[PDB]
Each structure stands twice: as structure tokens, then as C-alpha cells.
Amino acid sequence: PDIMEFVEQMGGYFESRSLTRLAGRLLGWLLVCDPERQSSEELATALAASSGGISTNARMLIQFGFIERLAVAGDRRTYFRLRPNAFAAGERERIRAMAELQDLADVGLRALGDAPPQRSRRLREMRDLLAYMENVVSDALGRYSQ
Amino acid sequence: PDIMEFVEQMGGYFESRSLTRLAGRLLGWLLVCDPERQSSEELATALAASSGGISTNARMLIQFGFIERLAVAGDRRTYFRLRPNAFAAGERERIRAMAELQDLADVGLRALGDAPPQRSRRLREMRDLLAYMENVVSDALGRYSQR
Amino acid sequence: EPDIMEFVEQMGGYFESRSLTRLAGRLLGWLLVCDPERQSSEELATALAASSGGISTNARMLIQFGFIERLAVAGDRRTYFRLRPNAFAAGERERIRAMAELQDLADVGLRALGDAPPQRSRRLREMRDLLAYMENVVSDALGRYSQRT
Amino acid sequence: DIMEFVEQMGGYFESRSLTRLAGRLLGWLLVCDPERQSSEELATALAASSGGISTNARMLIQFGFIERLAVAGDRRTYFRLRPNAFAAGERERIRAMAELQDLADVGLRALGDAPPQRSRRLREMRDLLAYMENVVSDALGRYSQ
Ligand SMILES: CCCCCCCCCCCCCCCCCC(=O)OC(CO)CO
Ligand SMILES: CCCCCCCCCCCCCCCCCC(=O)OC(CO)CO
């Protein structure tokens, strides 16, 4: 109903950014479903998706910091749940991603080591902005949790 | 050769994150190329890419805020170039993306309006964090641009 | 009392009067009042007496402006469009970007006039300064709006 | 490199679904010397047609950026960027928003019989436009001071 329209739009949000529709719909579903935890089979049914589709997109959302795998006592099935404060956890992963990109800027700067310094301006700006934003976000998340 | 390695690593960075390899390579190239502006054909031939591949991924990088389409005087070719302060521009786009997600959180909250408040906790957390971070990042970019 | 097609027509006129396409205005108007909110490409072409090409190109424009979104369903291979949540706020966010891009262009112009008398660059400086100020104003305002009004 | 900035302004316009010529014309009037330019001077500068200059100048006047003027002892039509042109452009945007908000009101009346949920989009539109009109008007007043 209105719920599946929300899930649909989460799919579009992802799709419009070159990410998978299914990952978006999965994130969406995990934001509104009841109970919060969902088995692999429940997700496949809910989303009209293959088990392979569920597995690969769940893996991606775990990588990005939004959801987690969990086990339920007495049950052998695989479960997933949106993490507590999931979008904060997402931002923590983005800090790590920014540091990774910083390291790549170094690679580029070394590669341009022989070239005029002006040519390296773009990479220096990238590295400097990333270093700045990592601190901004880390500090901000610290305060938020308080 | 060392430049090419950087470009490939940028491809890998994008690809590890469910984005296209070519978008990453294209961003990498626009970070290091000389001159900074590059024609569609220059990009395709530098990156071993089709025209369709260049067009699709250039458009994505424009969406993401990193590069711009460029018109060149007396020249009919399409050009692209890294935006000024490109990663700041990318962060501005992130603020906009966060605002879009916050709008969606509100849609979700309305959809759950008849359900117990507990069921909406996840969406409230999402909404609140996004609103907070949008403001934090906007303020920070303002302070930074004054450097 | 007005009806929906009078509104749609007037939205078309609003767009055309500003050198935008009439069909883009009518399409935006339709997506503001249609039920259901989501519409297929075919449904839009039918309702507006338009070609599939017209719907496609004008839908693309409204997406770029930030007002509408493309949707798709795995089982379905029709293209759907829908007005975005908080569409005009989203539109205003795109305007913030547009002003930033114009500010960057003003910088290009200022550099090109580097060897001219500074009086000649007054117009560009005014452009740059107004845009910087309005970007901040609008950004702050949309942040505050999201809280609610 | 002046023609480079001009060409780039043409691009900005064409990207937002306006004419390349209107963008080039605005660009030219931002950097030209003297600030005032005759119709023929504009056509020559931009390698443009007189009809193109006329049409696009009218649009830039409508948008608030430039003005048509007369020069004593001269028969020619002249144009010039307005003082604080982008503030003037913003003033015109406020007026455009008010017009658009009036249309939202038409839409709301047209849906008066329907369930109120169906009018949510139009209510959001109206609310945002009003809010922004107030914000921008306030901001422009403060800026001029
Ligand atoms: C090993 C580390 C793992 C970390 C977790 C994997 C990634 C988490 C999500 C990544 C999002 C993908 C962004 C793609 C564009 C890169 C832009 C960028 O990051 O910086 C710009 C952001 O706006 C600065 O301007
Ligand atoms: C008769 C009353 C006269 C008033 C003066 C008329 C002059 C109109 C100039 C301004 C409007 C330009 C056209 C835009 C129509 C869509 C709104 C917009 O541009 O797009 C969104 C894009 O993201 C921003 O919200």
C-alpha cells in the first residue's frame, strides 16, 4: 500500500545513483517491516526476489554499514536486521571510505611527481577536502551520540 | 604508467562499491589529465571506452557533482572537466542526497502513521541523523571555502 | 469553479511564458493532480494528447529540475513517473546547485578580465557576491523548512 | 578567453533548457565594454541574427537581468545589464513564485471535491513557494542594506 510505495521509492533512490533497485528496496523494507528482523526467505517473498538477489544485496548493505546478519536461538535460518542508528553506522563507513580515497590521491600525486605542481592542484584539493570532512563527520557523530 | 595505475585504482574504488568501473576511471582521468578539459572523443580514446560508456558515466559524474559539461568557443565538440573544488562540490551534492533521503523518511513515517510509535523508531532515527548531518556538513563546507 | 484541465493548461502557459516548453508545464501540472500519483509513460501521453517522444524529453527535463522521479518495477517493463516527495523543496535544492555553478562561472569571467580595469569587473563581482549570499540564505532556509512549516 | 566565459554561459542556459543565445547574451553583457551595447553591436559580437538578439533580449528583460535603453543623440536601440542584476533577477523570481503559487490555488480549488489526501502535493507546493517568497524577499532587503 503506502508502505510498498515507500519501498518502491527507496529502490528508485538507489537506482538513480547507479546502485541496484533491489538493494534500495531491501533497505526500505528493513526500515518499515514488522518484526524488524527478517529471514532470507521472508525477504525473498516480500520483495519478489531470488535468494541470490537477496544474498548479494544484503552483503552490499552490510558493507555499507546499514544492516547486520544475526542468528536467532533455536532456528537455523539466516536473518538480517537494520542496525541500530543505521545511518550513523553508514556515516562511520563513509569516514573509512574517505580515508581510502585519500590514500588514492597520494598514488596520483606520486604519479604526477615529475610534472609541474599546477597539474597536481586537483589531487591536492581532493586529499585536503577529504581529510577535513573525515574530521568534521567523526566529530559530529561523536557529539550526536551524546 | 604510474598515472594509469592511479586511474585503474580509482576504477576499483568505484567498482568495490557497486558503482561502475568506468565512472571511477573517468573521474581518475579528469583528476590528472592535461589539459584539464577533455573532449568526449579524447576521453573515449584515453580510457578504452565506447562513446556510450563515456556519455553514460560522464552524466553520472555530473549528477554526483564532480565534473561539468564544458562548451568551448568555436568548437562543436562536447567537453568535460573536473569542477572547481570538485570534492567540495561532491559533498554539496551529498547534502542534497541526504535531504532527498530525509524526504523519503517522512514518506515512510506517514505510511506508518497508524502503527505504534515503536515501529517508526528506525525511520525517526534516519530522519534525525540526516537532518543533523546536512546542517553539520553545510556549515563545515562554508567554513572550509573561507580558507 | 476551475477543473483539473484548466490548472494543467495554465501550468503549460506558465512554462511557455518563460521560454520553457508548454508540454513540460502541462506534465508537471498533471503529476501534481493525477490519481494515482504514479503514471506510466503511455498514460501520460494519452492524458496530455502528446507523443511518446514529447513525454520522454520533457520528463527528463523535470527530473533534472528536481520535481519528478522515474520509477520501475521488476515484473513490469513500463516506465513510470511520479512527482517527488516535497517536490518544490527538491526543486529549490537544485536551484542552490544552479547558483553554485553560476558562481563558478563568474570566477571564470573574473579571471578572463584579470588584465582589465577593475571597474569593468564590477558586474561579475556583484553577480558572484549575490549568488554566494543567496546560496547560503536558501540552504539555511530549506534546512529550517524540513523541521516544518 | 572572454569568448570562453560567454560560451560557457551559453552552456549553462542550454543545460537548463533555455536558449544558448540567451546565455551567451547574458554572458556578453556581464563582461562587455562599454556596458551598453546596441542591437547591431550585439549581433556582431555574438555572430547572431537580429531576431535572435531581439527575442533573447526580451527574455533577459523579463527575467530581470538587463534593460533596454536610449542614448541621447543616437537612434539605435541599446541594452545594458541592470545594476545589481542578479538581485533584480531574484526579485523577478519572487514574482514568478507568487504567480505559480496562485496556480497552486487554482489546482486546490479544482480538487475541492476530492479526498484531501489527493491535494497533498499541491499543498506542499503552495506552502514551499510561500515560505521561499518570504525568505528571499527578506534576504534581498537585508542584502541591499
Ligand atoms: C575500505 C573502506 C570501506 C568503507 C565503506 C565503503 C563505502 C561506503 C559508501 C561509499 C559511497 C560511494 C561514494 C562514491 C563517490 C566517492 C565520493 C566520496 O566518497 O567523497 C565525496 C563525497 O561527496 C567528497 O566530495
Ligand atoms: C507575470 C509574473 C511575472 C513574474 C516574472 C516572471 C519571470 C520568471 C523567471 C523565473 C522563473 C524561471 C522559470 C522556472 C519554472 C520552474 C521553477 C524553477 O526554475 O525550477 C526549479 C528548478 O529546480 C526551482 O524551484
Residue B118 CA to residue B106 CA, distance in Å, equals 15
Quick check: helix, strand or coil at residue A67?
strand
Cα B126 from chain centre: 21
H-type helices in chain A, by residue range?
2-15, 21-32, 40-47, 51-64, 86-111, 121-144
- Helix (H) or strand (E) holding C69, with range, is strand C68-71
Q: Would you say the CB of residue C7 lies under 6 angstroms from ligand 2? A: no
Residue C33 CA to residue C14 CA, distance in Å, equals 16
Comparing CB atoms, the residue among B13, B34, B144 nearest residue A100 is B13
Sheet containing strand B38-39, edge to edge, reads B38-39, B79-82, B67-70
- Choosing among 1.10.287.160, 3.40.50.300, 1.20.210.10, 2.60.120.1140, the CATH entry for D84-145 is 1.10.287.160
Choose the mutation target among C134, C146, C147 for the interface with B, i.e. most B CBs under 10 Å. Answer: C146
CATH topology assigned to domain B1-84:
Arc Repressor Mutant, subunit A (1.10.10)
Give contacts of D6 with chain B, Cβ < 8 Å: 73
Q: Report the gap between the CA of A46 and the closest CA in chain B (Å).
A: 17
DSSP D21-81: HHHHHHHHHHH-SSS-EEHHHHHHHHT--HHHHHHHHHHHHHTTSEEEE--TT--S-EEEE
CATH, domain range D1-83: 1.10.10.10
**3-class DSSP string for B31-55:** HHCCCCCEEHHHHHHHCCCCHHHHH
Taking the CA of residue C90 as reference, the ligand 2 atom at the shortest distance is: 23
Quick check: helix, strand or coil at residue A65?
coil
Pick from B31, B94, B103, C99: which is nearest to A136 by CA? Answer: B94
Pick from C83, C78, C72, C1: which is nearest to C34 by CA? Answer: C83
Reading the block at residue A142, the C-alpha cell is 561523536
Residue B25 CA to residue D17 CA, distance in Å, equals 30
| Sequence-separated (6 or more) residues with CB below 8 Å from residue B127 | B102, B105, B106, B109
Instruction: For chain D, positions 104-123, list CB contacts with chain B under 8 A.
Output: none
Question: The domain A85-146 belongs to what CATH superfamily?
Answer: HR1 repeat (1.10.287.160)
Choose the mutation target among A22, A133, A145 for the interface with B, i.e. most B CBs under 10 Å. Answer: A133
Reading the block at residue C140, the C-alpha cell is 539555511
Quick check: helix, strand or coil at residue C66?
coil
Give the bridge partners for A38, in sequence order. Answer: A80
Q: Would you say the CB of residue D102 lies under 6 angstroms from ligand 2? A: no
**Phi then psi dihedrals of residue D35, to 5 deg:** -60, -40
Pick from A106, A94, A87, A88: which is nearest to A133 by CA? Answer: A94
CB pairs under 8 A between B and D: 16
Comparing CB atoms, the residue among B6, B32, B111 nearest residue A2 is B111
Give the orientation angle of helix C22-33 with respect to helix D120-144, to 10 degrees: 120
Q: Does C90 touch chain B (CB under 8 A)?
A: yes
Tell me how crowded residue D75 is: count the other CB atoms within 10 A of its CB.
Answer: 7
For strand C39-40 and strand C80-83, is the pairing parallel, antiparallel, or unpaired? antiparallel
Please check whether residue C97 is in contact with residue B96, taking contact to mean a CB–CB distance below 8 angstroms.
yes
Please check whether residue C82 is in contact with residue C37, taking contact to mean a CB–CB distance below 8 angstroms.
yes
Pick from A6, A10, A32, A5: which is nearest to A21 by CA? Answer: A10
Residue D122 CA to residue D78 CA, distance in Å, equals 42
H-type helices in chain C, by residue range?
4-16, 22-33, 41-47, 52-65, 87-112, 122-147
Comparing CB atoms, the residue among A9, A12, A48 nearest residue C74 is A48
The ligand placed nearest to the CA atom of residue A133 is 1
Q: What is the residue extent of each domain of chain B?
A: 1-84, 85-147
Residue B26 CA to residue B4 CA, distance in Å, equals 11
Q: Report the gap between the CA of B123 and the closest CA in chain C (Å).
A: 15
- Helix (H) or strand (E) holding A68, with range, is strand A67-70
Q: How far apart are the first and last CA of chain C?
A: 28
Q: Which amino acid is at A127?
A: R
**Phi then psi dihedrals of residue C116, to 5 deg:** -95, 165
Determined by X-ray
What's the length of chain B?
147
> Would you call C72 and A12 a contact, using CB atoms and an 8 Å cutoff?
yes
Please check whether residue A26 is in contact with residue A51, taking contact to mean a CB–CB distance below 8 angstroms.
no
Alpha-carbon Rg for chain C in angstroms: 20
The ligand placed nearest to the CA atom of residue C138 is 2
D52, D58, D63, D67: CA torsion to nearest 10: 120
Q: How far apart are the first and last CA of chain A?
A: 37
Reading the block at residue A138, the C-alpha cell is 567523526
Tell me how crowded residue B67 is: count the other CB atoms within 10 A of its CB.
Answer: 25
Going from the C-alpha of C136 to that of each of C101, D136, D139, the distances in angstroms are 14, 11, 10
Comparing CB atoms, the residue among A8, A22, A48 nearest residue C71 is A8
> Would you call A8 and C70 a contact, using CB atoms and an 8 Å cutoff?
no
Give contacts of A49 with chain C, Cβ < 8 Å: 74
Q: Does C49 touch chain A (CB under 8 A)?
A: no
Q: Using the 8-state DSSP alphabet, how is residue A80 labeled?
A: E
Reading the block at residue C83, the C-alpha cell is 512527482
Q: Using the 8-state DSSP alphabet, how is residue C91 labeled?
A: H
Architecture of the structural domain at C86-149:
Orthogonal Bundle (1.10)
Residue C73 CA to residue C9 CA, distance in Å, equals 31
Reading the block at residue B86, the C-alpha cell is 570538485
| Sequence-separated (6 or more) residues with CB below 8 Å from residue C124 | C106, C109, C110, C113, D30, D31
Q: Does A9 touch chain C (CB under 8 A)?
A: yes
| Sequence-separated (6 or more) residues with CB below 8 Å from residue C131 | C99, C100, C102, C103, C106, D86
Q: Which chains touch B (3 or more CB pairs under 8 A)?
A: A, C, D
Tell me how crowded residue B52 is: count the other CB atoms within 10 A of its CB.
Answer: 9
CATH topology assigned to domain C1-85:
Arc Repressor Mutant, subunit A (1.10.10)
Residue D74 CA to residue C87 CA, distance in Å, equals 49
Architecture of the structural domain at B85-147:
Orthogonal Bundle (1.10)
What is the CA(A43)–ligand 1 centre distance, in A? 27
- The residues lining ligand 1, judged by C-beta closer than 6 Å to any ligand atom, are A 63-64, 93-94, 96-98, 100-101; B 17, 19, 87, 90-91, 94
Residue D93 CA to residue D91 CA, distance in Å, equals 5
For strand D66-69 and strand A67-70, is the pairing parallel, antiparallel, or unpaired? unpaired
Looking up cell 510505495 gives: A5
Q: Does A42 touch chain C (CB under 8 A)?
A: no
Side-chain-facing half-sphere of B109: CA atoms under 13 Å: 16
